[PDB]
Amino acid sequence: FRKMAFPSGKVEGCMVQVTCGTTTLNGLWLDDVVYCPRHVICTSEDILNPNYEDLLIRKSNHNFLVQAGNVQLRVIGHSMQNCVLKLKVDTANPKTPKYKFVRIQPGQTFSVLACYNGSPSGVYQCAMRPNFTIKGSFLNGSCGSVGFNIDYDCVSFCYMHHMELPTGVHAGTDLEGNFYGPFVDRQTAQAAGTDTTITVNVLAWLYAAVINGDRWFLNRFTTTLNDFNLVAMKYNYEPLTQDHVDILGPLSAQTGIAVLDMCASLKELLQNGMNGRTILGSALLEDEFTPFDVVRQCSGV
Amino acid sequence: FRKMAFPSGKVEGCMVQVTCGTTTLNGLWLDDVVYCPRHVICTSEDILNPNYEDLLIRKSNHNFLVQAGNVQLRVIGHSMQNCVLKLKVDTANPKTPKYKFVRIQPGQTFSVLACYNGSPSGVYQCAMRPNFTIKGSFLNGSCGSVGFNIDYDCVSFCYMHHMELPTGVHAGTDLEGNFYGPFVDRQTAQAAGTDTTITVNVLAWLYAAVINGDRWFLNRFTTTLNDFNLVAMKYNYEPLTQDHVDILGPLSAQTGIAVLDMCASLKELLQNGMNGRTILGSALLEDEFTPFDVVRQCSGV
Ligand SMILES: CC(C)(C)c1ccc(N(C(=O)c2c[nH]cn2)[C@@H](C(=O)NC2CCCCC2)c2cccnc2)cc1
Numbered sequence: 242f243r244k245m246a247f248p249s250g251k252v253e254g255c256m257v258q259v260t261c262g263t264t265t266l267n268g269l270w271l272d273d274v275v276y277c278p279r280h281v282i283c284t285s286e287d288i289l290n291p292n293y294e295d296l297l298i299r300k301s302n303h304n305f306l307v308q309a310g311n312v313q314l315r316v317i318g319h320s321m322q323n324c325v326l327k328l329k330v331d332t333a334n335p336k337t338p339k340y341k342f343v344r345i346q347p348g349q350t351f352s353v354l355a356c357y358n359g360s361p362s363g364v365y366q367c368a369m370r371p372n373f374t375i376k377g378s379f380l381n382g383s384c385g386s387v388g389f390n391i392d393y394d395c396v397s398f399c400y401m402h403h404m405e406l407p408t409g410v411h412a413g414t415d416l417e418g419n420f421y422g423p424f425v426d427r428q429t430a431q432a433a434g435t436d437t438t439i440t441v442n443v444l445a446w447l448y449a450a451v452i453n454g455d456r457w458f459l460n461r462f463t464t465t466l467n468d469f470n471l472v473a474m475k476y477n478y479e480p481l482t483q484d485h486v487d488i489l490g491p492l493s494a495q496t497g498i499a500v501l502d503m504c505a506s507l508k509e510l511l512q513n514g515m516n517g518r519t520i521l522g523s524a525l526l527e528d529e530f531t532p533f534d535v536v537r538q539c540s541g542v
Numbered sequence: 543f544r545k546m547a548f549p550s551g552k553v554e555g556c557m558v559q560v561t562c563g564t565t566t567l568n569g570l571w572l573d574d575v576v577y578c579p580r581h582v583i584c585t586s587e588d589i590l591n592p593n594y595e596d597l598l599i600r601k602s603n604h605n606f607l608v609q610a611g612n613v614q615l616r617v618i619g620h621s622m623q624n625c626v627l628k629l630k631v632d633t634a635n636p637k638t639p640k641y642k643f644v645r646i647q648p649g650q651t652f653s654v655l656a657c658y659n660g661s662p663s664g665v666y667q668c669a670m671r672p673n674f675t676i677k678g679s680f681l682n683g684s685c686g687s688v689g690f691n692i693d694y695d696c697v698s699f700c701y702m703h704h705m706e707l708p709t710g711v712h713a714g715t716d717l718e719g720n721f722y723g724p725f726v727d728r729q730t731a732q733a734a735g736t737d738t739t740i741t742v743n744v745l746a747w748l749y750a751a752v753i754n755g756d757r758w759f760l761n762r763f764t765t766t767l768n769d770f771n772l773v774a775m776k777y778n779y780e781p782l783t784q785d786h787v788d789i790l791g792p793l794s795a796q797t798g799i800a801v802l803d804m805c806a807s808l809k810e811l812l813q814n815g816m817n818g819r820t821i822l823g824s825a826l827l828e829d830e831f832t833p834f835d836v837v838r839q840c841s842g843v
């Protein structure tokens with residue numbers, strides 16, 4: 242078991258370089274449209290509080306250098322959708338895959354194809370934190386890189402990277418340009434909320450642990466949703482809905498451990514720590530595997 | 543910072559399904575040759591101790607079902623190179639990339655494109671353990687999947703997956719069919735050696751930590767290669783050569799921390815533990831990032 246990302250080829254053929262002035266960042270090229278963050282048009286003079294409708298008026302199609310590999314794309318149109326710029330180009334990407342644009346939920350995971358200058362550099366798995374940040378690995382110029390899921394031959398695009406928040410975490414939008422969370426594409430004082438722990442994900446990781454022969458933390462007891470949740474709010478774990486229990490049905494059925502039985506096991510580790518013990522090679526509780534990531538890794542989808 | 547894998551598209555176009563009898567596993571299709579493990583030809587009757595030259599004699603080209611996606615490939619030849627079967631087919635893979643075949647060293651890392659039935663399912667980063675095993679995430683039928691590095695446009699193939707060892711770790715070969723380590727493609731009692739810790743890699747991960755503002759473990763002292771190594775053999779850490787120090791030159795120069803200064807810091811954490819503290823979100827010392835992985839992740843190659 243291990244953090245595992247989707248194969249990235251379907252998405253690598255879509256990454257291009259977008260230049261605007263002396264600003265360079267990554268774009269996503271689907272059919273005849275290049276999606277990139279709209280802060281590409283900011284100059285260092287306007288970053289504190291840019292007027293984007295105004296900044297974009299001063300721009301002309303030929304201020305926008307789009308490069309696919311080493312081919313140069315002809316920008317025949319430019320418009321702004323929320324925080325995303327849509328650059329209409331004259332070629333449709335021959336490598337465009339079947340795709341949809343999805344807004345994901347806090348707790349859900351995706352792969353990230355980290356790019357610089359339109360070239361991929363790496364792929365890794367992320368979760369959307371409950372406070373709508375992502376704990377990424379992104380450098381300067383990683384802007385425009387995308388997060389995605391692949392359900393056989395269909396790429397669901399769900400995240401486009403925009404900024405680092407000075408706290409070291411990352412903020413971005415869906416592919417329609419709406420930020421995840423309260424954040425703005427502006428160099429301004431911005432705070433993420435307090436960041437909680439995705440309980441349903443920690444429970445799935447415990448199931449993965451049991452599936453892989455690591456079972457020391459399994460215990461006697463049961464408990465209820467109500468009583469476990471009330472311990473859960475004390476360690477800043479997210480409330481466990483009844484749907485979360487239902488989402489864990491396949492995992493529970495595969496191990497013979499009922500959901501509330503595993504909760505009772507988790508409730509103990511919260512009040513007691515792991516006391517020098519590991520679980521799946523880790524001394525803390527992991528919360529960035531969904532129950533699907535765990536079923537998928539243990540079913541070889 | 544994070545375990546980060548190479549973009550996998552160049553390798554996804556090379557994965558095919560190879561069937562032989564009722565055995566199904568993955569093959570690697572480069573130009574007109576499909577590489578796959580030779581244990582594809584084993585029946586459950588011969589697995590305890592197969593005679594492979596003899597088993598292969600009984601086989602004919604048309605016992606070998608090779609499928610590329612849903613295209614069927616015509617096998618016009620079959621031969622055995624060490625533990626690898628080379629199936630000559632009549633089509634050259636149109637998607638063949640620039641590639642070399644490399645045998646890597648214990649300690650070195652690579653990405654794995656985990657496949658089943660010739661279709662990719664996920665990509666993750668691995669290290670070759672000093673005992674020539676890999677701590678993988680592989681299920682039944684993951685045989686034939688490959689490990690690789692990408693140095694701009696050149697895929698270096700370095701690992702092909704063969705078996706799980708009952709201890710839960712994984713064993714395989716280079717693309718010339720020679721096993722890493724003492725292992726044999728035979729259902730027989732096999733033991734990996736005692737598994738040590740890649741010291742040069744742990745030092746690089748400490749540098750990554752310092753580069754990312756996490757510095758609590760940095761200390762006063764220095765030490766020497768000789769004196770640190772002598773603490774190092776006590777915690778089953780690998781000996782630190784002088785080349786390892788030289789390999790750490792770029793990292794040391796970027797942080798202003800000399801190599802032996804960082805060693806003195808590591809020597810303390812060995813004798814004292816992390817005492818509830820984390821480093822880069824981890825409560826143990828990571829040893830599966832090379833100094834290049836750390837420079838690459840902190841330079842955006
Ligand atoms: C104009 C605006 C919206 C303020 C902005 C400014 C810079 C960038 N950053 C570009 O690297 C970059 C590259 N090309 C254009 N911007 C980086 C970024 O967020 N620093 C923020 C850090 C402190 C708060 C102000 C900006 C970045 C670093 C690491 C990983 N991810 C992104 C992103 C957005």
Ligand SMILES: CC(C)(C)c1ccc(N(C(=O)c2c[nH]cn2)[C@@H](C(=O)NC2CCCCC2)c2cccnc2)cc1
Nearest residue numbers: 567581584589680681682683704705706708727728729
């Ligand atoms: C014939 C030979 C060499 C003994 C062999 C037998 C089975 C396989 N395994 C196939 O899954 C598989 C699929 N198609 C053909 N074999 C699996 C495997 O290693 N079990 C070993 C476990 C105990 C020791 C005997 C075999 C496997 C599981 C998980 C991840 N990786 C591989 C590999 C090699």
